[PDB]
From a paper:
Despite being solved in two crystal forms, the crystal structures of forms I and II of apo s2 from ColG are similar. Each asymmetric unit contains two noncrystallographic twofold symmetry-related molecules. All four molecules are virtually identical to each other (r.m.s.d. of <0.5 Å). Each structure begins at residue 685, although the first two residues (Gly-Ser) are remnants from GST-tag cleavage. The last residue is either 770 or 771. In apo s2, intermolecular antiparallel β-sheet interactions involving β-strand A could suppress dynamics of the region. Conversely, the PKD-like domain of collagenases consisting of multiple CBDs, such as s2, appears to have no surface aromatic residues. In contrast, the subset containing s2 is likely to be different; the lack of surface aromatic residues on s2 suggests that the domain is less directly involved in interactions with collagen. In this context, the spring-like dynamics of s2 may allow it to swell the fibril.
Residue numbers in the entry: 685 to 770
């Protein structure tokens, strides 16, 4: 369709205080070209950029979202759940 497709690549698990890498590299668009990647790590924190990194302060289950926007201004968001342990 006209929306881009957002995809979040990352690990299913991680540890408190460790940098976790997330990537939007497999996002794609039939009807435009993606220009921006906005991340929400589920603990209040955000980042920008195709490849982003976050460390969680506490153990828990977090829903990471990625919103991609394309050159025509069309958006899509996708979610990824990560379990963080001590």
């Amino acid at each position: 369709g006209s929306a881009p497709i957002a995809k979040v690549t990352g690990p299913s698990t991680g540890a408190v205080g460790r940098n976790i890498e997330f990537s939007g590299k497999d996002s794609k668009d039939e009807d435009g070209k993606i220009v921006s990647y906005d991340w929400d790590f589920g603990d209040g924190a955000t980042s920008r950029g195709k490849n982003s990194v976050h460390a969680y302060k506490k153990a828990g289950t977090y829903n990471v979202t990625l919103k991609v926007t394309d050159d025509k201004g069309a958006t899509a968001t996708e979610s990824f759940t990560i379990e963080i342990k001590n």
